[PDB]
Amino acid sequence: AYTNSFTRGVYYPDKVFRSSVLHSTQDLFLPFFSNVTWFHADNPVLPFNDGVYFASTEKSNIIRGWIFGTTLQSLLIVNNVVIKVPFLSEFRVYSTFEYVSKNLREFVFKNIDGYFKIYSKHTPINDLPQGFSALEPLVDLPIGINITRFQTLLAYYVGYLQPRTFLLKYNENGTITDAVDCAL
Amino acid sequence: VQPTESIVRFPNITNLCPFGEVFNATRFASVYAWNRKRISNCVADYSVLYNSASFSTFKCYGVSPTKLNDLCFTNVYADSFVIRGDEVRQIAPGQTGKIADYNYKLPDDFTGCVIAWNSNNLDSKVGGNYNYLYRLFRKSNLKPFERDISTEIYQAGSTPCNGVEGFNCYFPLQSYGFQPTNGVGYQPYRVVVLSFELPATVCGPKKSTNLVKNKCVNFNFNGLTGTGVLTESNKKFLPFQQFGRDIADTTDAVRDPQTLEILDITPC
Amino acid sequence: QLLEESGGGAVQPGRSLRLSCEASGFSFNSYGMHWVRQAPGKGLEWVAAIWYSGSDRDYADSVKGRFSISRDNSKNTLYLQMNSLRAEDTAVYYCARDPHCTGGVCDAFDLWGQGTMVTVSSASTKGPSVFPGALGCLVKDYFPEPVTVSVHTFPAVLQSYSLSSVVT
Amino acid sequence: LQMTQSPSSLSASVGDRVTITCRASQSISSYLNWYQQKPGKAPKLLIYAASSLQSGVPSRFSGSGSGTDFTLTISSLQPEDFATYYCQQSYSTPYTFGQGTKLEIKRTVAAPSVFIFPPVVCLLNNFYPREAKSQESVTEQDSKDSTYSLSST
Ligand SMILES: *[C@@H]1O[C@H](CO)[C@@H](O)[C@H](O)[C@H]1NC(C)=O
Ligand SMILES: *[C@@H]1O[C@H](CO)[C@@H](O)[C@H](O)[C@H]1NC(C)=O
Ligand SMILES: *[C@@H]1O[C@H](CO)[C@@H](O)[C@H](O)[C@H]1NC(C)=O
Ligand SMILES: *[C@@H]1O[C@H](CO)[C@@H](O)[C@H](O)[C@H]1NC(C)=O
Secondary structure: OEEEOOOOOOEOOOOEEOOOOEEEEEEEEOOOOOEEEOOOOOOOOEEOOOOOEEEEEEOOOOOOOEEEEOOOOOEEEEOOOEEEOOEOOOOEOOOOOOOOOOEEEEEEEEEEOOEEEEEEEEEEOOOOOOOOOOEEEEEEEOOOOOOOEEEEOOOOEEOOOEEEEEEEEEOOOOOEEEEEEOOO | OOOOOOOEEOOOOOOEOOOHHHHOOOOOOEHHHOOOEEEOOOEOOOHHHHOOOOOOEEOOOOOOOHHHOOOEEEEEEEEEEEEOOOOHHHOOOOOOOOHHHHHOOOOOOOOEEEEEEEOOOOOOOOOOOOOOEOOOOOOOOOOOOOOOOOOOOOOOOOOOOOOOOOOOOOOOOOEOOOOOOOOOOOOOEEEEEEEEEOOOOEEOOOOOOOOOOOOEEEOEEOOEOOEEEEOOOOOOOOOOOOEEEOOOOOEOEEEEOOOOEEEEEEOO | OEEEOOOOOEEOOOOOEEEOOEEEOOOHHHOEEEEEEEOOOOOEEEEEEEOOOOOOEEEOOOOOOOOOEEEEOOOOEEEEEEOOOOOOOOEEEEEEEEOOOOOOOOOOOOEOEOOEEEEEOOOOOEOOOOOEOOOEEOOEOOEOOOOOOOOEEOOOEOOOOEOOEEOO | OOOEEEOOEEEEOOOOOEEEEEEOOOOOOOOEEEEEEOOOOOOEEEEEOOOEEOEOEOOOEEEEOOOOOOEEEEOOOOOOOOOEEEEEEOOOOOOOOOOOEEEEEOOOOEOOEEOOEOOOEEEEEOOEOOOOOOOEEEOOOOOOOOOOEEEEO
16 A cells, blocks of 8 residues: 655754854655555554554554564664564564663654664654644664564554755754755 | 963763774674774773884874874774785775775775784795685775675676586685794784774873853864863753854854753853 | 494404494485494593595594594484504593584584493303392403392402392 | 592582592693493593583583693582593603592491301491492492491301
8 A cells, every 4th residue: 555745754854053054965765755565453464675654643541562573683672672682462473682771653763873772753643634743853763783673563654765965954943844855 | 362271171081992802802793794893981091002113004094093082982893803904005095906996995085094914923834825815806896985795706708607616607705824934024914993083982191171251262172173262152952062163163062071061152 | 313333242362343333314425424332340532533525534643543433414324433452442432523613513523422332352252140249240251341140239349240239 | 641530439418529630751742532431332432632512511511721730620519420531641652541530429337237148258238438348349439328338257
């Protein structure tokens, strides 16, 4: 199933505060107006080339976490976060690292340069609007592995990041309000 | 306006770095499977390493060896392997050979240090020292920082082979024949390559001063220098951001890493 | 992963035997391979070794010029070819692997094998003659070891073999 | 080379320290390995390169020394640590082993029970320590109470 997002996916690409600058930036981004691949809730193993946009509207705590690996070392995230290096009800996911910490949860992952990155945001809504948010970095995980296929877990949406080139605008307070696409 | 004194504000970290576990190990790895280790969240004294008389090669490249106790570093590594005597000159950017083409290759924008010493009295047996190897034949060259542990059989001829060894099909590895009476030049030298990149966690042992404001002094917040008048700031940093710049693209707002507070830098 | 040895159990003095060692479950060609024997009730003793090149090998002081170690990296096997056996070449023979330095263990052979008894004597294969006591057994005049008895059991002794086992 | 291992006999109680010494005859380096052999099976690796524990061995065992003097030391025993201990040099070919230190269990003195079987076999059953009386044949430690057993013909 192929639906479309029309303006999403922008995240802060650097840890430098700015204000009132029209700044030019080249990284991995979600291409604007892209045929995202709306699934239905059953748990397909998926391709994972560069980084995956992951958006899920939600009512009652259905979405739990992800698995990341090659042959299925491998990576686990379970939602209180458990990270270590199927369905969950009871703990029946399977048969050297640790960490711990209406709705529209929107995640963006990456895996570059030995580090694993997560940018996050979740906002209210009443499918995918014209609204424009940004995703703060949430964690940085130095595990440095070969992730090429992921699989969601249960008790949503998937795009793909192409290497693109944007121009961004910060407000007075240092928050992104609009993004200009320069390679559409 | 002339400055008055200097200010240094490092983090409040005290423990020492695991450098004994890299330099003083009982036996290293051979060069085709070179070891690698991350160093993070510690206080690294490079003076005690540099001012030893043991090291017969110490060539830092992007950074000078004297001013290593002052900066702050991100992504420190340490790589340990064992090579010959006349092959230490290839652990450098833009060198060509066998150790630098099939075994261990350094990039061009390299920023680190290359340490070596003579370890003839620790790595050399009276018979034949058959436990340090190196790759001899490979189809292509390497990337930067790319390992290849694959003992598959090589094919130097037009005819194919299989998992057998014969005519014009070779076993790709080879051993050094270390020997306690080799001439100086075939003896085992023992290399450690540091590499770092210039959000920092590991840096040097400069004692932290205390913050003065509202006048023209020097300042050093995590290896970032200058002079300026540290006012009190109004900028609203989201808690992952640390530095801060303007359209003139110079540093103008900094988080003090000891006491979390936003400061402004107006130029003198 | 394990190392299983086949190979004979009994020969005349002055003949030949050919042992084997069939490794299974790892990369065979990247390790060195050794042979270590054990006279009955005595310490260990080193016999042969072969390495990567196929023409570099070593032997003991005694057996050098009589044995011939060779490998074969396709069938994952290691061979030993004993020729012109003497009386005191009787033992249990083991094959062991020593890695090369990649960070972990080095030149201490860590993985071992089963063991295949080799008996060198002029005797011929004979069954026993079990005599009852008055309580225990007197299993006498057999060849070669081993033999089980269904409580103590005593180790067998050579005769110019005969053991005994006594129930309490 | 010629490696010399001592003491040849030992008897200890559960919870002691033991010191095995294995002196070489010309200097080598950190090239020395320590093995354990439970009677019947294959040997097993404990310490390699004169000081490093092998992955799987507990941190109770620890060896040390270099040059010509080498020493293995257990901190406080367990009932599963009773065997023969060997030391091997890795420097010159041939690689010579040692002689072995047989590690026994200690208890109090018990009494033999003498039998005789007519046609002869004289059974000395269940005594400690092992002492004297056409050849003789003695067992190992009967590991429920660590007692010998002997015969003569
Ligand atoms: C989206 O799907 C339509 C369906 O025909 C296709 O024509 C179009 O090229 C696609 N556009 C993008 C940006 O994927
Ligand atoms: C990464 O995983 C893929 C699986 O599709 C594999 O083909 C590739 O060789 C792997 N890379 C490395 C360096 O192992
Ligand atoms: C900037 O922050 C101030 C906080 O004092 C807030 O009142 C204002 O609404 C923010 N600006 C915008 C455009 O939201
Ligand atoms: C290595 O060990 C020696 C003592 O044997 C010590 O003096 C030296 O500083 C150590 N090197 C380090 C810690 O880098």
